[PDB]
Amino acid sequence: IDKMVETTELMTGNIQSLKNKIQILASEVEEEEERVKQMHQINLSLPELSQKTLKAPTLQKEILALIPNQNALLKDLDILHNSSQMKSMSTFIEEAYKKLDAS
């Protein structure tokens, strides 16, 4: 009986403390969660993605640490991004695509 009484009194003390703490924190968080949306709108029923997606390895670091010779590949990647041949090719591709979406 003594050990059970000690356990339950410690538990209810911690419960009251944590209750007061969560109360004051919840009352405080409201002003900042309202100020965060001052210049931004508040908020299509799309389900929210799970935390496995948010904690998955991102794409940019994998690309950067996966390929060698960054600038040795950019040296003509920039040129082909400046070449108008591929630009006309992409315009043809996108024209064909929008023609397909029109039907």
């Binding site: 908020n43 299509l44 993605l49 935390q51 794409l59 940019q60 992409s90 591709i93 695509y97 929008k98």
Partner: protein, 224 residues
Amino acid sequence: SKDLKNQLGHLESELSFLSTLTGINIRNHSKQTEDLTSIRKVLQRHRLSGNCHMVTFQLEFQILEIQNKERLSSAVTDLNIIMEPTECSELSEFVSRAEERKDLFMFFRSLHFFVEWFEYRKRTFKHLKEKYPDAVYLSEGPSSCSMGIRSASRPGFELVIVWRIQIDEDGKVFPKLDLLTKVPQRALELDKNRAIETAPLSFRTLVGLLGIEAALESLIKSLC
């Protein structure tokens, strides 16, 4: 023959209802039976085609029903599915996986989930396209994976958002959202605060804060 016409109409209505409820529209079906008895063993070759709301398929398999005194064991000994040759490589990868694993129900479940996520991405990309036609440039189309956000003021400062659909080894489907920043070195020599290299990670926090489309429109408004 009015009762027969009523029965035909009722059966057609029930078929349409089941098709729009489950989500699979089935085509004709063929069956061939062979009696290979030694205790009895029968071989049934089935073939059927159909489609799921965007994707057509044609499958042909064969089962070996072993009927005996107390057990009736039915196992799919061989299966073969064929679909139209699109550009989705992970779809064919899962096709080969289900081919080598010889499973039928998991294939349909994964196909349903995949087409659901595909139509979700399609209806999400086209919505923000016409809403902000001056801040987004869909270079490949609404049925694609990439997305290009760019302002008409300067073609130098623009970035891309990536939306892919992944199918794991178990069979489940889960998407992934990343972004890649193509910004000239002028913005890097201008700003010494260095808040762009940590942009992807933080961006994920953003989409983990108040939604997906909300984060997208917030990024559009900030770049605007």
